[PDB]
Structures are given as C-alpha cells and as structure tokens.
Design an enzyme around this catalytic site. Sequence first.
Site, PDB file in Angstrom:
ATOM      1  N   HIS D 108       1.124  -1.193   0.313  1.00  0.00           N
ATOM      2  CA  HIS D 108      -0.095  -0.216  -0.213  1.00  0.00           C
ATOM      3  C   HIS D 108       1.007   1.094  -0.234  1.00  0.00           C
ATOM      4  O   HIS D 108       1.880   1.276   0.569  1.00  0.00           O
ATOM      5  CB  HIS D 108      -1.331   0.047   1.343  1.00  0.00           C
ATOM      6  CG  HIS D 108      -2.138   0.680   1.197  1.00  0.00           C
ATOM      7  ND1 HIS D 108      -3.302   0.408   0.865  1.00  0.00           N
ATOM      8  CD2 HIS D 108      -1.759   2.406   1.712  1.00  0.00           C
ATOM      9  CE1 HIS D 108      -4.271   2.017   0.700  1.00  0.00           C
ATOM     10  NE2 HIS D 108      -2.936   2.910   1.446  1.00  0.00           N
ATOM     11  N   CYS D 156       0.350   3.117  -4.295  1.00  0.00           N
ATOM     12  CA  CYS D 156      -0.378   3.973  -4.519  1.00  0.00           C
ATOM     13  C   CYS D 156       0.450   4.993  -4.575  1.00  0.00           C
ATOM     14  O   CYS D 156       1.211   5.300  -4.053  1.00  0.00           O
ATOM     15  CB  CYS D 156      -1.880   4.135  -3.407  1.00  0.00           C
ATOM     16  SG  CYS D 156      -3.168   2.857  -4.834  1.00  0.00           S
TER      17      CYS D 156
END
Lengths: 88, 88, 168, 168
Positions: D108, D156
């Site tokens: 992430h 991300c």
Amino acid sequence: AIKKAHIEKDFIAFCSSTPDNVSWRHPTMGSVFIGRLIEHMQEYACSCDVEEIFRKVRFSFEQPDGRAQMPTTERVTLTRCFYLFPGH
Amino acid sequence: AIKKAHIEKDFIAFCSSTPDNVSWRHPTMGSVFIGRLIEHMQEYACSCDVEEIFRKVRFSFEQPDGRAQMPTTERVTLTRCFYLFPGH
Amino acid sequence: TSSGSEGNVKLCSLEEAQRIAEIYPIMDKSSRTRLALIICNEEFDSIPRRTGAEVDITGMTMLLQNLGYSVDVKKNLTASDMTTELEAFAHRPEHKTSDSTFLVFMSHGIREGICGKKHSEQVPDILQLNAIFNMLNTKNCPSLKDKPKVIIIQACAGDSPGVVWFKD
Amino acid sequence: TSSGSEGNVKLCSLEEAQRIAEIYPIMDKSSRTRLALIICNEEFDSIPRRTGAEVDITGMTMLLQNLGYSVDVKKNLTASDMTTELEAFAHRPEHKTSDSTFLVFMSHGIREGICGKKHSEQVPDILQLNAIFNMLNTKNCPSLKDKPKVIIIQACAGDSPGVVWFKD
C-alpha cells in the site's frame, strides 16, 4: 591513491503511478503494473534496454479505462544503456 | 461525449544534479550543465531522441573532478520517443 | 551553415528522418507555433549574484529558437511571480497549434526546490518542482495534452559536493 | 523453450547480441553472482489485506530468476524492518561479483512513500523512496558502484484516480 566518484549514479526507479495518483491491483490476477512489466520484460529484454522497455510499459497504459494509472520512471542516473542480454 | 485522459503524461524533467547535491556555474563561461546540454543538443538532436541525448549528457559528467555533478532525469511520463527533427 | 535559422544545431536530413508509432508526431513547419519559456534568476535580495547567467540565457534562447521554438524570457522573479508566469504560459493559445514545449528554470537552488528572488533562510521563497508539473499537466494545461513537455533545471539540489572517495 | 532457466523470457541470440561504449558491461555467466530483493507487504495491522500479492510475488520472482538473479523475498515488514533489510542487502558480498541488481517494493502507498505493516493515519510507518536510494548509493553500497540499480515499486502515490475529462 584515492579517487572521486559520484555518490548517486546508475540508478533507475519505475513506479506504478504518477504522484498523487492510485495504482490498481486485481484480487486474483495480481497488480496491473506488475503483470504488465513481466509481460514486457519477457518480450523486450532480448531486443531493448530497460529505459525503452519501461517506456513501452507506459505506452500500454496510454488509453485509460475505469481503472487508470500512468507508471513513472524516476531519479534516473543511468549513464549507459542497460541490456539484460537474456540467455547470456 | 466525454473521454478519460491521464492527468500527468508526456513529461520529462532534466535537472543539473542529484538530490542533496550541488550544481556548478562558471562566472564567465556560464553553467556547466547548461553549456553541456547545448553542446549535446546541437550534436545529437538530428540523430537521437531527448531521452538518449540526456543520457549522453549524464555520461559526459561520469569522470568527476574538483567540481563534480551528476545531472538527473526525473518524473518521466514520455510514452513515445521525442525526436526534434531539426531542419523540419 | 550557422547563418540559417537552426544555427549550430546539426541538421536532420530527409534520409535520416525516414530512417527514424513509437515517435511523437511533428506538426507542419509552416503552420506550427512552437513555444518555450525561460525563467532565469540572476539578481537576488539575500543570496549572492549569479554571475554568468547571461551566458546561459543567450545559449538556451538561441538553442530553443534553433529547434523552432518562440522563446519567452523572464528574469528575477519570486516564487509567486514564477507561478503566475507559468500559469500565463499555460494559457497561451499558440500551444494548441504546437507539438511540444520547453521549460527552462535557472536559479539558486535547495533540496526543496528552486529559489525565487526574495529567498532567505528566515523567509523562504521556493518554487517546488511539483508545482511546475501541476501547472503544465492535462488538467491545468489541456492544450499540451499528448505533447512532450521538457523541463530543464539549472540549480543546486542541496549543499553536498556529491562525491565519495574510493581507492585503486 | 519454457523448461529452461530463462523460462518465458524471449532469448537474445548471439547475432542479436553482436548487433547491440554506451552499454553496461555484463559479467561472465559462469562466475557472476547476480542478486535481487523483493519486499512485499500483504498483511497489515490497520490497512485492508492486499489480496493477489502472491501472484505478484510469484511473477516477479520467476522473472528475476529468468534474467539470472538470485531472489531474496521478504514479507510483511515495517518501515524500520525494510530499512534494516535493505542495509543487509547492501552488505551482501555477492554484489562484488555481480554486474547489476533489482529492488522490488510492493505494498500500500501514499504520497510520502511506501507503507509498512504497522501503518495508520495516526501512527504513520512510511519508507521514503529517498531512503532506498541512500542505502544503495556509492557511499552506503560501494559494491554496486558503476552498476545498474533498478528499483520497481507497486504502490499508490496518493488517493486521486489520476484522470481528467476531455470532449471529442
């Protein structure tokens, strides 16, 4: 005798998306960028250098859909072309 | 009808030195990186794309002296090769 | 010959051009309106004068013109003025009939970014690279969509000499 | 054939290799000890599970081996553990008899960098890209001097979908 050398050199980073933006991952098929990179490495490692392969990966993302991302090459200090010469 | 497009695409940045590090400028001859870029653009715009020209510029800085710097390509989203085609 | 519009830039011949789907399209030379911007900071309030900046301005301006770009030169601007100028450059209608652009930033620099004219350690005046991209992207500059945007920066990225020692 | 060590990676023939001063030198296949590291975070404390990460691990590991690299795989690490692991990877003596390396980071992500296993909005656990380069540069990793260091990141870079609308 001692000689001077650049502290930072011969680096290349390839990220899955541009700053501020998201990257996508299929829960069973895996990450889009990762799968796309493998596909392009398998095909173009023989004939292209890493900078060109990475450019081709960016091109495959050119037409955006519902889940869009633009992979980014960052902090390049490659002074030469890096060919993988697979098989050698 | 409306269509989706990547917010950030077709960018390339070329900086005079790596992060944390200095760039040099001759008080009468001008900046080293700028003069080196002009020299390489004049020579290689005809036969090379901008990514390759920039790589050659990095290579000309490879052997460090008393005043050393390593120019850096940053935040690349070029999906194609950019040739200047000088004269056309 | 250097007397031509391309000056000292070596020409790409017709046979060379044909030898070169993976390339950015080039607009017709007759109709295209190529634009380029140079922002150079020579005179500052606190930081010492950037002697030799005029050589850099002359060099880059002549080169960008040689490559077919109409060059806008702006000097000694604050970070706020640079932002305003970059916003103004993004709005220029010539970009619609252009195939690419060149941005040149020349100034004193730190790790955070490019120094404006009023920069000091107490009252910073910094233009971040992140702000440059944001003003020129597809959202804030739709005219340069799908077109190469080349950013050139002459500045320090910090204080370190950038070298390490090794023995033979 | 896919039964070989290069698997599904298309082979570069001897005639192709000769067709290709501007290239990074390749060490002898018999003596070289190529190394690669993959750090993948699937299980987290606060952030939802990264389902499909095992497909990414399998894919990248097989590919890097196909290109001749011995692959180290580390899973579910904090930013501190990643730093420690990257420091340990930089010290590996095989790098001296290697011509290059590959670093893969999968997790992430936010604007500031890559999330560790313990990351939350209240107590952040972030590995900055700036830290990765610092641990692998000539000062902290002299063994990989003049050698290509390729960093791959799946994460991300923020929350935005990354898209703008335009009409035909």
